[PDB]
Amino acid sequence: KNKCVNFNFNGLTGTGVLTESNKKFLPFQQFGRDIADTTDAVRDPQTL
């Protein structure tokens, strides 16, 4: 956490830092996006 690293998820690849999010996700969706098709939140596939 808190380091600009590389992301290798199941269906996503990016670069950035990882901090705590105050949002709420539904169990029928993995990640979230902004209004300009940019990713801002990802779910860990191991722990919820």
- Site residues (CB under 8 A) for another protein? 35-38
CB of 39 to another protein, least distance (A): 12
Q: Phi/psi at 8 (nearest 5 deg)?
A: -135, 85
Q: Which of 19, 13, 16, 15 is nearest to 1 (CA)?
A: 19
Alpha-carbon Rg of the chain, whole angstroms? Answer: 11
Which of 19/38 has CB closer to another protein? 38
Which of 2/38 has CB closer to another protein? 38
Which of 37/44 has CB closer to another protein? 37
